[PDB]
Write a protein that binds this ligand. Structure first.
Ligand SMILES: N=C(N)NCCC[C@H](N)C(=O)N1CCN(C(=O)N2CCC[C@H](C(=O)Nc3ccc(Cl)c(F)c3)C2)CC1
Ligand SMILES: *[C@@H]1O[C@H](CO)[C@@H](O)[C@H](O)[C@H]1NC(C)=O
Ligand SMILES: *[C@@H]1O[C@H](CO)[C@@H](O)[C@H](O)[C@H]1NC(C)=O
Ligand SMILES: *[C@@H]1O[C@H](CO)[C@@H](O)[C@H](O)[C@H]1NC(C)=O
Ligand SMILES: *[C@@H]1O[C@H](CO)[C@@H](O)[C@H](O)[C@H]1NC(C)=O
Ligand SMILES: *[C@@H]1O[C@H](CO)[C@@H](O)[C@H](O)[C@H]1NC(C)=O
Ligand SMILES: *[C@@H]1O[C@H](CO)[C@@H](O)[C@H](O)[C@H]1NC(C)=O
Ligand SMILES: *[C@@H]1O[C@H](CO)[C@@H](O)[C@H](O)[C@H]1NC(C)=O
Ligand SMILES: *[C@@H]1O[C@H](CO)[C@@H](O)[C@H](O)[C@H]1NC(C)=O
Ligand SMILES: *[C@@H]1O[C@H](CO)[C@@H](O)[C@H](O)[C@H]1NC(C)=O
Length: 339
């Protein structure tokens, strides 16, 4: 017997107590070892409601990653609130590791194992777990990287699809590689290579999934209509360096177009931080070939408003609220109290 409750979670990780990589160092002192003997408990014939868009776990992971980056990804200068601060900003080792979220005694985590679960409402195949699986805290905009994949079809997630202000999380069932490189020896110029055959296939499937939700209306993709570079570009951290990649070549409805898509990128030093209002300034990039090969496993989308008297729905890549990133992996969990 249980009821919906919120409590203070703890984390578990396979961090190596030697590694200087920042998530390992943080997980070494802020998390416990992962359960070596985990065993979920099926809740035979239990139907339970979930809400990924209203889930305290997401906020608790958000505070962790805020704490993690604050302890690890230190800018030389922060302009937080007008009170500029010039501190140490050594170049670090940065490569996200899986974090597990675990309940204390007297609570458990209910896990939705419905393969088509969209994030909100009833789940019919519920199990109980002590900890989540290992979630990589990958910070990004527009494209969700290195996540899990949807088990069956492409899943559309939104608190309310009808509300255009509510962000859409596309959970892909097939990952699309994105290979980003700042070549060795304009030291901020970089590029991400994406196989255009794969991407346009997956994007076409996304259009067709979106059609099912929008009355078979014409689905149009467009670049973001204004905003900061972090969200108008596909932003992410690669080996400590902030990459900003132009995805206009991705979010065109063009598709003699199917070779390698090369996105122009810039490594940016002055960041509009995702943690909270503030610009952070980092050092110029490290030397050498800076390369991150990531799986695109999700897309963050915002649907244009004022199209109800038209035949089209236009979608633009979104992001900025990293809670939606954690939400994209935490969606099948929810904390309950042992009543
Ligand atoms: N109880 C509640 N429900 N509270 C609501 C929470 C809102 C949240 N606390 C908040 O204040 N917030 C500050 C304003 N925020 C912003 O203004 N922006 C606009 C500028 C860019 C930012 C970007 O995404 N930066 C970025 C940087 C590096 C990388 Cl690698 C990357 F992928 C992305 C996003 C964020 C949330
Ligand atoms: C429920 O999920 C389990 C994994 O926990 C898996 O065997 C299958 O997808 C589902 N099985 C039943 C009997 O519902
Ligand atoms: C998710 O599924 C539930 C089923 O109860 C439904 O009410 C809700 O509208 C669905 N959301 C989306 C975005 O499809
Ligand atoms: C990338 O995707 C492949 C298959 O889609 C998967 O086997 C691999 O584990 C993924 N890599 C990472 C780092 O998640
Ligand atoms: C992914 O989902 C789409 C529907 O959204 C489906 O047509 C396609 O076959 C799926 N691919 C895989 C590998 O499951
Ligand atoms: C979904 O959003 C629309 C648009 O504002 C709103 O009219 C509707 O009431 C919302 N649905 C729910 C369940 O809140
Ligand atoms: C990534 O791109 C670089 C530069 O084009 C290339 O040398 C490397 O082989 C690529 N790696 C993968 C896994 O595609
Ligand atoms: C691009 O993707 C298609 C389909 O997945 C594949 O057949 C092709 O080999 C890929 N191209 C390259 C250059 O890897
Ligand atoms: C991305 O590139 C396109 C085409 O070159 C350009 O029109 C657009 O302004 C670029 N995006 C940004 C945010 O500058
Ligand atoms: C995604 O995972 C791969 C393999 O672990 C890693 O090389 C890459 O840097 C990761 N990408 C990001 C953005 O963390």
């Amino acid at each position: 017997v249980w009821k919906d409750a919120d409590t203070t979670l703890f984390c578990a990780s396979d961090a190596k107590a030697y590694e200087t990589e920042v998530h390992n160092v943080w997980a070494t002192h802020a998390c416990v070892p992962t359960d070596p003997n985990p065993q979920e408990i099926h809740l035979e014939n239990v139907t339970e409601n979930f809400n990924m868009w209203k889930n305290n776990m997401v906020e608790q992971m958000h505070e962790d990653i805020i704490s993690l980056w604050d302890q690890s990804l230190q800018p030389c200068v922060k302009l937080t609130g007008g009170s500029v601060i010039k501190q140490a900003c050594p170049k670090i080792s940065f490569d996200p590791i899986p974090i597990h979220y675990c309940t204390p005694a007297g609570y458990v985590i209910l896990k939705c194992n419905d393969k088509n679960f969209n994030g909100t409402g009833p789940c019919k195949n519920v199990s109980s777990v002590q900890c989540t699986h290992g979630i990589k805290p990958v910070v990004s905009t527009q494209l969700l990287l290195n996540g899990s994949l949807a088990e069956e079809e492409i899943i559309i997630r939104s608190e309310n699809l009808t509300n255009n202000a509510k962000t859409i999380i596309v959970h892909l069932n097939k990952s699309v590689e994105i290979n980003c490189t700042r070549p060795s020896n304009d030291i901020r110029k970089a590029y991400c290579e994406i196989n255009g055959t794969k991407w346009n296939k997956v994007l076409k499937q996304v259009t067709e999934k979106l059609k099912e939700h929008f009355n078979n209306k014409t689905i149009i993709f467009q670049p973001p209509s204004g905003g900061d570079l972090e969200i108008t570009m596909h932003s992410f951290n690669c080996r400590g360096e902030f990459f900003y990649c132009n995805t206009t070549q991705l979010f065109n409805n063009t598709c003699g177009c199917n070779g390698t898509i090369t996105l122009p990128c810039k490594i940016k030093q002055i960041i509009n931080m995702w943690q909270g209002t503030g610009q952070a300034m980092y050092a110029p990039p490290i030397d050498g070939k800076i390369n991150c090969v990531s799986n695109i496993t999700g897309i963050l989308l915002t649907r244009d408003g004022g199209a109800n008297n038209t035949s089209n729905e236009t979608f633009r890549p979104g992001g900025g609220d990293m809670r939606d990133n954690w939400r994209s992996e935490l969606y099948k969990y929810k904390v309950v109290q042992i009543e």
